[PDB]
Amino acid sequence: GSKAAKKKNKRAIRNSAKEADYFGDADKATTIDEQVGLIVDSLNDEELVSTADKIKANAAGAKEVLKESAKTIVDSGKLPSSLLSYFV
């Protein structure tokens, strides 16, 4: 229920691919950003901030957090690994 944080964090998680670079996979930038969006939408308020926080702790390796989220989402069975195929 952190309505103010949700809006910021939701996009912030996705901005990580910008801020931490597309990791050399800039050709699939669109795919990458979409997957991160599916990540943020399948997560909740607390997860958004939790992962985001880690991203600010390591801006250079935001992917580590995105991969963590991705695997966690696949783990719970929210999203198939195929949808997050870049990180997972």
Experiment type = NMR
75-79: long-range contacts (C-beta < 8 A, 24 or more apart)?
A: 78/42, 79/38, 79/39, 79/42
Tokens of 46: 């607390």
Round the CA-based radius of gyration of the chain to a whole number and report it.
12
Q: Which domains does the chain have, with CATH numbers?
A: 1-88 (1.10.8.840)
Tokens of 10: 């939701």
DSSP for 10-66, written as a single string = HHHHHHHHHHT--TT-GGGHHHHHHHHHHHHHHS-HHHHHHHHHHHHH-GGGTHHHH
Largest CA distance in the chain: 36
Tokens of 27: 């050709």
Report helix, strand or coil for 86.
Answer: coil
